[PDB]
Amino acid sequence: FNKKADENKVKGEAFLTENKNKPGVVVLPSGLQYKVINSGNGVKPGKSDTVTVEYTGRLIDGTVFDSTEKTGKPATFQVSQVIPGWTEALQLMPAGSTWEIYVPSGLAYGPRSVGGPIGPNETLIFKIHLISVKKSS
C-alpha cells in the first residue's frame, strides 16, 4: 500500500512546489505557505494565546477529510495546541483576514498516514478565517 505513499509524496512535493508558486501564496523557510484570501490587518494571537476560526481541510489530491468553514462556525484553538503550520500562521494571520495555509506533512499530521483518508506521506492544507482572538495573559 506504500504505493500510495509515493503519490502523496510526489503530489505533495509538487503541491508545495506548486503552491509556493501559486499567486497569493507566500512561502516560509519552515516550508509553511500561506495565502491571504482576505486582508484584515487586525489583531491575532501568540503561540500561547487562543484563537477563534472556521476552516476546511483537504488533501493535495482534493480528498477532503475535514471541514468547518463550510458550516461557517468558528472553532477555538490555542496556538500552542494547534498544528505546527497553524501555530505560526495564526500568529501571522490578522483578525478579520481570511488566509489559506498549506502545511507540509512535517508541519501537519506527520509524514505517515496519521488519519482516516489521510494516507502515507500526506501534506494537508486548511483554509483559516479569523473571527475572534483571545489572549493568555
Ligand X SMILES: CO[C@H]1C[C@@H]2CC[C@@H](C)[C@@](O)(O2)C(=O)C(=O)N2CCCC[C@H]2C(=O)O[C@H]([C@H](C)C[C@@H]2CC[C@@H](O)[C@H](OC)C2)CC(=O)[C@H](C)/C=C(\C)[C@@H](O)[C@@H](OC)C(=O)[C@H](C)C[C@H](C)/C=C/C=C/C=C/1C
Cα gap 126→75, rounded to integer Å:
13
Q: Which is nearer to ligand X, 16 or 83 (CB)?
A: 83
CB 137 within 8 A of CB 49: no
Cα gap 70→20, rounded to integer Å:
25
Which range binds ligand X by CB under 6 A, 31-39, 40-48, 76-84, 95-103?
76-84
Q: Interface with ligand X includes 125 (CB under 6 A)?
A: no
With CB under 6 A as the contact rule, the residue among 17, 39, 48, 81 that binds ligand X is 81
Q: Interface with ligand X includes 99 (CB under 6 A)?
A: no
Q: Interface with ligand X includes 110 (CB under 6 A)?
A: yes
Taking the complex as a whole, the smallest distance from the CB of residue 47 to ligand X amounts, in Å, to 12
Cα gap 27→114, rounded to integer Å:
24
The residues facing 52 across adjacent strands are 76, 132
Q: Interface with ligand X includes 71 (CB under 6 A)?
A: no
- Positions that interact with ligand X (CB under 6 A): 55, 57, 66, 77-78, 81-84, 86, 109-110, 114-115, 126
